[PDB]
Amino acid sequence: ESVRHRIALLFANEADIQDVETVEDGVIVFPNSNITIQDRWTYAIDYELDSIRRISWRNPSSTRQFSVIESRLAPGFNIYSNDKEARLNLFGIQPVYSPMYKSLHSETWKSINEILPGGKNLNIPWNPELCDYDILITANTVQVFSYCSLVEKKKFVKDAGKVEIGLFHVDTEDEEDINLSGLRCTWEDTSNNIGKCEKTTLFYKPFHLYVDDSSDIAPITIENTNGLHPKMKIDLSGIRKDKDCRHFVFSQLPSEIFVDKFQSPGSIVFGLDDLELPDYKVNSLSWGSESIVTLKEGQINEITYFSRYLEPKERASNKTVGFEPILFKACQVGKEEDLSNPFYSRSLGYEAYFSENTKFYHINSTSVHVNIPYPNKNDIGNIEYTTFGIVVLAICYLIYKLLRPSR
């Protein structure tokens, strides 16, 4: 059916692979210790075009730890497109322009089946609350990556199109030159019975490194949480600057929050960077802003997240809004190493700022919330009348004071 399916089973212990049952028409697995599932669906469509599109969804509230076979997706539902002629207005979200792409962002899950080209329907178990999705649309191919966790016994059989399965375990590594070892199996085209599995070894140097284990390298703090402009403080005093390592904070903010890009050197802000206009004056321009902010090593770095004024409505109340910036250190590596692995590939996103030969070390992703109150839109008449009456009385009193005879 012009479908190709690739399944990846990331385990934690070598003995866990023993528990895997290989029946003549499938593979039955019972979870042992928080294994990871990576599903890759590939389609071929004509779709004559010369642009790339990315649709990445990661649950903001998700607490799942990233694996070596998964990229660090930007939190929330994001759509990037590098085309400079088509218009991006899906779901009523105004795009944000950047020298490489137009981007749409949201913090709540949206339906994806209406965006997938060709009107293709397939047996996808959309589980937005417990899975991470990444859809890549190319000139002639469509790829769908789903990262999930197994919490129950599952049986994999011959799905639509060609099917290939691979179970891997992470051997000894030094957070570089990562080696996976395990089994690879394929499904016959003429029958629903599995083939003969073979030993396989994959060697690759990742460009997405996770150091989120322990040792509180760069603690994150938030001060003035109740205030309108809470301060985000990052501690890098104990870490010395390296030759090619530069730390950064990447934040996708809504239209009600902006960052003064002149606070720190080497900060880039795309979208609504206006420092004066309120929320109701720039709400319809775009969905917000994307900011990448550099940090100075050896000293505490402070970032201010200002908030605008919201349009008054009936029954005055506050409109708390949250966002999650991510802290990552980017290091340049010589242009000889092959920074390519079969699992994930570079594409549009926050990686488009940096070059091709970069490696990211993700440290912390502490989330922030801002409370913004608005008044009641029923006191306009009272305010008008009181203000004008007071002003008129004051000028009348001053005029009376002026007319006083001399001597």
Place this chain on the structure above:
Amino acid sequence: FKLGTIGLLSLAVLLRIAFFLFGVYQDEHFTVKYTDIDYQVFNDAAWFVAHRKSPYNRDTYRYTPLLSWLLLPNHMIPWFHFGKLIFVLCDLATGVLILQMLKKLKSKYRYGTDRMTIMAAIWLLNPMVITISTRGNAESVLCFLILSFLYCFLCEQYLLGGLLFGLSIHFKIYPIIYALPIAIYVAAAHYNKTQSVFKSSFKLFLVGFSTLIVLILLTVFMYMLYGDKFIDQTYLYHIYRTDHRHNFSVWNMLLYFNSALPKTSELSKFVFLPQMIIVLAISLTQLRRPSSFPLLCNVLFLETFAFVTFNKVCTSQYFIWYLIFLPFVLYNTRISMRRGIVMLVVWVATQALWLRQGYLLEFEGQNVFYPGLFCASVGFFVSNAWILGQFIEDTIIQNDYVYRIEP
């Protein structure tokens, strides 16, 4: 005892130096950023100018380009505190001009007693003015210019007075309000020496022509150099401004609510009429006794007080606009001590109440927009109006015993 003028100047210089050293040491060591945001804006504009680029690329920079040109030695010479030194020098020049003005006036107009030291120390020995000058605020420079042209009017140097008046008008648009009184004085200033209307009218035309030509030449030169953005950000902003951030002004909440609405109310476009009416009414009092410099100074002080009080925006930095004129008003004042104490107490109490409401709103997110902020603004405006009326009564009483000592 009686302080010596030389000793007063020396102690003022010592205070300025000590505060500057405090500032530089605290900036270097403490992570509190004593320097104000305005100095950061000016420094960024100076950097843009030094890199052969328009200073208006820096957001929220609406000053004239001359400020950035003056601060250029920040980047021409590798230091950051040069603007602070220039502002401190301007503040010292302002104090010296105040002392010289009082000394010259005491020998031409009959005065009550000897009070040069106290009235000079009102400005030269104020930690508030010291903090304003040493934090990078540029107001002092404007203040200096003002005194300069006024001094040129005292010593019958009308041409340089007109040139400096035009320069100050170019720097900030508000000194235009001084045009109506000063002109009258100039005419009378020549009627008491030469009994020929021709010479006085010619001198008035000369000073008007000089100030107009200086203003127009500076405007044309700046526009030609820096494009339409200069004209926009310098002139049209005051026309399309929608300042809604909390401030001492009475029109704050009204302007916020009006900016919320898409169509302005009919009785909401006359926010400029009361200010013009009261300014003209206060200006007309100069006719009581022309050819008098103390009366002119009092009229200018009342005009500045009324303009700041009725302005659509008013913060803690707008007070200095009239504080410079405080000594000349208070040299021959007749207010009882209890009345002055009452005025000061009411002023400070209203300011403290508004500051508490604003701090609650900013650092706690509470909804104190309609009931809290508006009432505090109304109370502050009423107190300011009462103080202005009292000062007008004071100047009307003063105008009596300010006879000349002509032979």
